[PDB]
């Protein structure tokens, strides 16, 4: 197994990867804007958070600092096209808010078309190196009842996968329980 | 879709899995422990931070305040059984130690088998609801080369994919670019 030292950012950073990509879904009055985050995870269960890890660099970042509410919303693998649109353009030069969406109860706005989603309430932001983790508190779900296993889980190989620059995957349909 | 208000716990917490478990590895002094973690993210490219996220209800809690150094493998889909038997077992109670493993550059223990690894140093912990956020700096990497592309992805198909509630799968072998 080979071997070296750490000497800045990796040649690549996806030994971790695939991940499930969240699309972060912000509203400041009447922009709306959306954002693909694989670096997203769960974060506690009692109470449920969920955290986003946003660079300062992308326009979401300010939004939700401001709104200090958003949406995570996970998309079936057949959306791979708009996730990535939407993770290649930024809200600085295009309108992202008129991709199909709906505003939840809490005001967010939700990309249309996916299997589950959740509306957050910002908790707490905290900077680690050039990324900044959002920390979000679960206030409402949403789930596509016909994409969804018996535990709210996307059916046999329907969630998007991200594997880093630009490719995507989905998973097996076959499954196993040891 | 149907939709709810957060009350609580949600009855499952799964539906931004799946997920690639972190088999994180700690040691202090002769003592060695192996716990997967699903709750894992890239947090920072420019330095790069990786992080996990542990309940203090684990042994591996302790021993990660303790030691201030671990290691996160990723496993190819081959090891399900072993990655689930490390996740269904506690160090209070069986030497998880004894799995095949050898030590990296830092003295962190790396589980045997992985197609990547990091080797970490903590650089911050923190408490988000029931679980805690370990913040660790990659120090050195660890890869089996011929198993990640030119870019140092891992190749698809390989991965080890956790749904929840002891449920596996892998990655399908199709790839998308968008
Ligand atoms: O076998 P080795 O030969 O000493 O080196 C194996 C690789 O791991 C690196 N390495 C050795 N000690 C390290 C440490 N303590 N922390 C991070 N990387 C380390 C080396 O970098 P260096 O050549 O920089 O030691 C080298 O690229
Ligand atoms: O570089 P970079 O600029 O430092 O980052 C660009 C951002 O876009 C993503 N990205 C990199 N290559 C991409 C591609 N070909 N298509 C869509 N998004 C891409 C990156 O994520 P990843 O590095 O995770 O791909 C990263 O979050
Ligand atoms: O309306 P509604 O539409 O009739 O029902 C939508 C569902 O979402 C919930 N909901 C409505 N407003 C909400 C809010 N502000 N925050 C979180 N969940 C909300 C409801 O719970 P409640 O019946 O508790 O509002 C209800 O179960
Ligand atoms: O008590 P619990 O608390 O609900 O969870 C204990 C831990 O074990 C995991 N877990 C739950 N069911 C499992 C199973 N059947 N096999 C392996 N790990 C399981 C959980 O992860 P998940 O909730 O992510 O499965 C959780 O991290
Ligand atoms: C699949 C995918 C996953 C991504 N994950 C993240 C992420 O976790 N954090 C981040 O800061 N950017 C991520 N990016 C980059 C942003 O999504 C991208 O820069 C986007 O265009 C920013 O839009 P904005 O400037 O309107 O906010 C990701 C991109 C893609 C395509
Ligand atoms: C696939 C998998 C992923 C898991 N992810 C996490 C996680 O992110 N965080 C956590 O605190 N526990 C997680 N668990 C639970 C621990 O791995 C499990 O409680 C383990 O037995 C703890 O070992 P320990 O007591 O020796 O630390 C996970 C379990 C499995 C099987």
Redesign the interface.
Same mark, same amino acid.
Request: aromatic share 18%; net charge negative; hydrophobic share 40%.
């Given at each position: 197994? &080979?071997?070296?030292?750490?000497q =800045? +950012? #990796? +040649?690549?950073?996806?030994?971790?990867? $695939? =991940? !499930?990509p /969240?699309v972060v879904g912000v509203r400041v009055e009447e922009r709306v804007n959306f954002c693909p985050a694989?670096?997203?995870? @769960?974060?506690?269960?009692?109470?449920? #958070?969920? @955290?986003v890890?946003i660079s300062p660099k992308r326009f979401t970042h300010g939004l939700l600092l401001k709104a200090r509410r958003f949406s995570?919303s996970?998309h079936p693998?057949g959306q *791979?096209?708009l996730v990535?649109?939407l993770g290649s353009h930024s809200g600085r030069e295009v309108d992202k808010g008129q991709a199909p969406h709906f505003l939840?109860?809490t005001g967010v706005p939700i990309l249309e078309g996916?299997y /589950?989603?959740?509306e957050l309430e910002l #908790?707490?932001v905290?900077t680690? @190196?050039?990324?900044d983790?959002f920390?979000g &508190?679960?206030?409402? !779900?949403? %789930? %596509?009842?016909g994409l #969804?296993d018996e *535990?709210?889980? +996307?059916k046999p =190989?329907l /969630?998007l996968?991200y594997?880093? *620059? =630009?490719?995507?995957? &989905? $998973?097996? %349909? %076959?499954?196993?329980?040891?």
């Open positions: 197994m &080979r071997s070296y030292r750490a =800045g +950012p #990796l +040649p690549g950073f996806y030994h971790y990867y $695939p =991940g !499930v /969240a694989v670096w997203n995870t @769960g974060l506690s269960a009692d109470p449920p #958070l969920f @955290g890890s995570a996970f693998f *791979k096209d990535h649109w939840g109860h996916a /589950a989603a959740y #908790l707490e905290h680690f @190196g050039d990324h983790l920390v &508190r679960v206030v409402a !779900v949403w %789930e %596509e009842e #969804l *535990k709210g889980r +996307p =190989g /969630a996968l594997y880093g *620059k =630009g490719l995507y995957g &989905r $998973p097996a %349909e %076959e499954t196993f329980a040891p």
